[PDB]
Swiss-Prot record, chain A:
Annotated protein name in UniProt: Small ribosomal subunit protein uS8m
Alphabetical keyword list: Mitochondrion, Ribonucleoprotein, Ribosomal protein
The species this protein was found in: Saccharomyces cerevisiae (strain ATCC 204508 / S288c) (Baker's yeast)
Subcellular compartments: Mitochondrion
Cystines in this chain: none
Swiss-Prot record, chain C:
Annotated keywords: Disulfide bond, Mitochondrion, Ribonucleoprotein, Ribosomal protein
A biological-process GO annotation: mitochondrial translation
GO molecular function: structural constituent of ribosome
Residue window of motif Cx9C motif 2: 47-57
Name of the featured protein: Small ribosomal subunit protein mS37
Species this chain originates from: Saccharomyces cerevisiae (strain ATCC 204508 / S288c) (Baker's yeast)
Residue interval(s) of motif Cx9C motif 1: 26-36
Pfam families recorded: CHCH
Subcellular location: Mitochondrion; Mitochondrion matrix
Cellular component per GO, a single term: mitochondrial inner membrane
Cystine connections: C26-C57, C36-C47
Role noted for this protein: Component of the mitochondrial ribosome (mitoribosome), a dedicated translation machinery responsible for the synthesis of mitochondrial genome-encoded proteins, including at least some of the essential transmembrane subunits of the mitochondrial respiratory chain. The mitoribosomes are attached to the mitochondrial inner membrane and translation products are cotranslationally integrated into the membrane.
Family under the similarity heading: Belongs to the mitochondrion-specific ribosomal protein mS37 family.
UniProt main location, coarse: mitochondrion
UniProtKB/Swiss-Prot annotation, chain D:
Endpoints of the signal sequence: none
Top-rank taxon, per record: Eukaryota
Other remarks in the entry: Present with 6890 molecules/cell in log phase SD medium.
Gene: MRP4
Biological role: Component of the mitochondrial ribosome (mitoribosome), a dedicated translation machinery responsible for the synthesis of mitochondrial genome-encoded proteins, including at least some of the essential transmembrane subunits of the mitochondrial respiratory chain. The mitoribosomes are attached to the mitochondrial inner membrane and translation products are cotranslationally integrated into the membrane.
Cellular location(s): Mitochondrion
Complex formation: Component of the mitochondrial small ribosomal subunit (mt-SSU). Mature yeast 74S mitochondrial ribosomes consist of a small (37S) and a large (54S) subunit. The 37S small subunit contains a 15S ribosomal RNA (15S mt-rRNA) and 34 different proteins. The 54S large subunit contains a 21S rRNA (21S mt-rRNA) and 46 different proteins.
Protein family: Belongs to the universal ribosomal protein uS2 family.
The protein, known as: Small ribosomal subunit protein uS2m
Species in which this protein is naturally found: Saccharomyces cerevisiae (strain ATCC 204508 / S288c)
Curated annotation (Swiss-Prot), chain F:
Keyword line: Mitochondrion, Ribonucleoprotein, Ribosomal protein, Transit peptide
Role of this protein: Component of the mitochondrial ribosome (mitoribosome), a dedicated translation machinery responsible for the synthesis of mitochondrial genome-encoded proteins, including at least some of the essential transmembrane subunits of the mitochondrial respiratory chain. The mitoribosomes are attached to the mitochondrial inner membrane and translation products are cotranslationally integrated into the membrane. uS12m is required for respiratory growth.
Species lineage: Eukaryota, Fungi, Dikarya, Ascomycota, Saccharomycotina
Segment of the intact protein contained: 29 to 152 of 153
Subcellular location field: Mitochondrion
Protein's recorded name: Small ribosomal subunit protein uS12m
Species whose genome carries this gene: Saccharomyces cerevisiae (strain ATCC 204508 / S288c) (Baker's yeast)
Entry superkingdom: Eukaryota
Amino acid sequence: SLVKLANTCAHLQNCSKVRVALTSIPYTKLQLQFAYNLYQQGFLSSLQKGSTMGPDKDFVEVTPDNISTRRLWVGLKYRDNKPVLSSCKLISKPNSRIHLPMEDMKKLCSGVTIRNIKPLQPGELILVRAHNNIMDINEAISKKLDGEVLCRVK
Amino acid sequence: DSVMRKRKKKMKKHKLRKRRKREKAERRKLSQGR
Amino acid sequence: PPVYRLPPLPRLKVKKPIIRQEANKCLVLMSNLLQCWSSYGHMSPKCAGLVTELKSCTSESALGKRKSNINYHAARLYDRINGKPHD
Amino acid sequence: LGQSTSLWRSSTQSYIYGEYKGIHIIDLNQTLSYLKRAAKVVEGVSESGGIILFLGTRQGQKRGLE
Amino acid sequence: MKIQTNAVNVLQRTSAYLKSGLLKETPAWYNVVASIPPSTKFTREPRFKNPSNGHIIGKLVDVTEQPHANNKGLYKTRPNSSDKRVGVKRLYRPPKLTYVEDRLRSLFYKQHPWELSRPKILVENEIGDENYDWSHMLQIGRPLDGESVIQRTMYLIKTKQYGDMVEAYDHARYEFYALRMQEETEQQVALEEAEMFGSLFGVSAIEHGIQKEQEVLDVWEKKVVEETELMAA
Amino acid sequence: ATLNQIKRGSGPPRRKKISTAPQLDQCPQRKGVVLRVMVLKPKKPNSAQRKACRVRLTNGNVVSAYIPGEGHDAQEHSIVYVRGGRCQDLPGVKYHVIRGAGDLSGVVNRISSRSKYGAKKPSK
RNA sequence: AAUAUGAAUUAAUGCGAAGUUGAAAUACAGUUACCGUAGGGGAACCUGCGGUGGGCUUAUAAAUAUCUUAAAUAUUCUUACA
RNA sequence: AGCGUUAAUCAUAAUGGUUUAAAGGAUCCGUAGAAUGAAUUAUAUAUAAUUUAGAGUUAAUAAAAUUAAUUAAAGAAUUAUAAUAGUAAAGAUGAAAUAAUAAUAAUAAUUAUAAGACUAAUAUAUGUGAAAAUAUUAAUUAAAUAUUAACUGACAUUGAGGGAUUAAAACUAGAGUAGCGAAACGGAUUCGAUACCCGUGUAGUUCUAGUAGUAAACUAUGAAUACAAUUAUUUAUAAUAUAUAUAUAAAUAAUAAAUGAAAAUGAAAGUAUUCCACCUGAAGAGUACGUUAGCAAUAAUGAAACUCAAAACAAUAGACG
Ligand SMILES: [Mg+2]
Ligand SMILES: [Mg+2]
Ligand SMILES: [Mg+2]
Ligand SMILES: [Mg+2]
Ligand SMILES: [Mg+2]
Ligand SMILES: [Mg+2]
Ligand SMILES: [Mg+2]
Ligand SMILES: [Mg+2]
Ligand SMILES: [Mg+2]
Ligand SMILES: [Mg+2]
Ligand SMILES: [Mg+2]
Ligand SMILES: [Mg+2]
Ligand SMILES: [Mg+2]
Ligand SMILES: [Mg+2]
Ligand SMILES: [Mg+2]
Ligand SMILES: [Mg+2]
Ligand SMILES: [Mg+2]
Ligand SMILES: [Mg+2]
Ligand SMILES: [Mg+2]
Ligand SMILES: [Mg+2]
Ligand SMILES: [Mg+2]
Ligand SMILES: [Mg+2]
Ligand SMILES: [Mg+2]
Ligand SMILES: [Mg+2]
Ligand SMILES: [Mg+2]
Ligand SMILES: [Mg+2]
Ligand SMILES: [Mg+2]
Ligand SMILES: [Mg+2]
Ligand SMILES: [Mg+2]
Ligand SMILES: [Mg+2]
Ligand SMILES: [Mg+2]
Ligand SMILES: [Mg+2]
Ligand SMILES: [Mg+2]
Ligand SMILES: [Mg+2]
Ligand SMILES: [Mg+2]
């Protein structure tokens, strides 16, 4: 869900503000994907499944017995007295969800304000959902996927 | 509203009340039978 | 027991610090003499030495002999003694 | 021996090892590494002929400081 | 207190000045600070073990990991309320260090109040230099006290001479007692010897105490008389 | 300010302009007939004697119009053209009689700013 | 039926002019001020009832305190001693 | 070869706000919502089958005796009447008088009857209630906390319109009426005194049945969810080997960060998401007209013309009291 995603973004921002190292997130598929995307772009130092109490050392299979207590632990990242993941504003908010075609995404990438989105920035990452798979907006353009403009990290 | 600002409003309300008191018989005359 | 933590104050100080000095000797003697004269009529010689002692005390002046640093300490140690959280 | 459990600046959390006797206890391997780093920079400025200034306002510290 | 940027970014700020020409000459510290960089990564780092005990902080016991019946014979089939709450503050707040020896220490001084009256120097000599074999109590650098007993108890526990802790403690206590008795006898006999061979002690401990009391009493008496006089008048 | 609220009528208050001269009826001038011609006392603190006049326009509504210039020529019936200025010190007069046209004559011996009054070019 | 214009007489309100009567408010504004409401009064207002602080968090003592080698020992010590 | 001016149009700040400046509905309940809202997999934002983390249901085990409504009790005093004995003042105020005060024998005192209305300490409104509210006792009926066990399987959030409750005053009936007390009358005060003080003291305050639906109905701060750095206090829960030092929550008080016009807010006035209400210069005005509702007072709804370049808040330094 999108509300959840917004909440996790807010939590990430809060954690960046006070400089915590290792932070929990809810264990869902969309959320996991988002976390993986951040990790690959280079905003998170670590990403690992775990309990509500902490990250897991060994593998523990997730079932109806565990699922309520399961959690996604995430390492934050800092360099020269400045946090890497400064912001996590989402674009498609729950009330005004926005879905762009490939042309619109291209325009956004090339410095054009679209549907009241400030076009994407030098060291920024706009994530895009396309058939229940979160991608970079550039990646989506390359693959040519009309998708929901999810969120924005800087 | 500060107290000073409120005091103008209070004064206005008082004036209105006075006007209503004055125009009671007149109001009565106007109301009944029309 | 019920502890009572104050808020952050501008300055911990007692408004007036009492020294609690001893009462005057001459005054005491005078009171004793008065007490003696309550009994034994006006001026009987039971209080013959007491009157003399009073006179000796109150010869140069009516009273014989003529401050507590508590504010300085409170002022000094307020910032320490606070449970004021960090900056 | 760190300050106290109730006089805690949480900014210093990484440095502290655990609490005991109602007192935070400073991780001492960490202390060592930081001391070494500090010692090296002290040596370097002395080598370069820099002006080192030792500041110590507490009561007993004067003689050792001098 | 906000994380100060300007205490650790000193060389960068000076490097900029040097580039500009605001600074003609480089500082003495500049090269040194370049060589040895500051930390500048003021994070809250999480901790996963209590160092004293060796308990695990991070882990959660699952429903599948608790198959057998509970106290009051109910099988756990669900996560409880506490198993759902996100326990992140436990990872970050520093661990309360616990030792088995602390309890033994507490017990000993309850059992032996007058051992507290034996003065204790807390100013450490080189902690690395020592090397005590707790096969016996009497170590060289260390004095005889409840601590030594406790160390002996711990040694016994480790070696499994006494498998039970209580028995080991008792044994250590009994070892201590004999030593204490011997110490007591030594001093008395030394005193006797001194008395025999014409040694002269100017002030004995009891005499000293009496003298100390006397001054206090004298102080009290004058004050008390004044107070009585005050009361009278 | 919620998205739904915005949809059902909410936003910034659009401001452009409000009519300075309503009685003029959305046009540059209107012809009028002077009724009376006054000398008004201004607001405090500035003081003078302002040569205003009352004018019934052709559209019907009556208006207090200012008369500029040092001296003027206006009776109780003169044909006068009104424009939408405002005499700032006199309250309740939101108009100017335009001075070259009508029975109102051009202001005499005017050298500077002649078109602002009626004044023709003197022609050597 | 609705709308528009007119109406003797009449009410409110605005702007100007600073005249008269008091002095209600701002300080403990010389009866704490204001909310709701009711009654009274030339006029501000006054009085009852409950409410509010946008007035009192403006907050700052009934006082007494202890014994171990005072020194040939501590106090000195400049990478020495061990 | 136009330049001025007037009349117009577009641009020129919502890349806004509502504790204190315009602006949170008195409070909750709940309908619509073309408002928003968990998990996993598979179908070609939906369907389908599975989940239990939200939201509920019922037990069990601990606690708590509070809030409603109703019925039954208690208490210090107050006034009035009467008796007793007793003597000249009493009562009041800044100081005085007027009065159902007193030489018809008072006031004070001691008794004895009656009447209403209030609830000292404990008390912190701590707590409890949706908010108005709510502390003498008891009973009845209703509702209420936490943790476990089991079950339901997103059933939720918010909520236009709507609905219900809503202090004090007011009103309509019928009781009641000690004390207090608008008004009125009288005495003071004062230049005056339609006041502040004193005295008589009617409505009212009290109960029963209603009407009405407003208050500085205020935390001047709508509800919900996720999240973020410390400390100290209590409160409850669990374990500990009943009294210890521990783990949880909850509240209260200081703060970090952050936000902020600042004052300051501090788990919200922070970081975010959702839904509703409301604001768009000051006067005129919550006025007029109109409509609806009310026994009425009134309540809600709610304009325009006319006139200004003002008007407002936080804080600063003075002067002043
Ligand atoms: Mg306001
Ligand atoms: Mg000119
Ligand atoms: Mg010219
Ligand atoms: Mg008709
Ligand atoms: Mg007319
Ligand atoms: Mg006067
Ligand atoms: Mg007066
Ligand atoms: Mg007044
Ligand atoms: Mg006063
Ligand atoms: Mg006054
Ligand atoms: Mg006043
Ligand atoms: Mg009156
Ligand atoms: Mg009042
Ligand atoms: Mg005031
Ligand atoms: Mg104040
Ligand atoms: Mg715009
Ligand atoms: Mg409210
Ligand atoms: Mg309001
Ligand atoms: Mg609701
Ligand atoms: Mg509420
Ligand atoms: Mg009470
Ligand atoms: Mg009340
Ligand atoms: Mg009533
Ligand atoms: Mg009645
Ligand atoms: Mg009266
Ligand atoms: Mg009702
Ligand atoms: Mg009203
Ligand atoms: Mg209201
Ligand atoms: Mg209230
Ligand atoms: Mg701060
Ligand atoms: Mg903000
Ligand atoms: Mg604001
Ligand atoms: Mg605060
Ligand atoms: Mg109308
Ligand atoms: Mg109304």
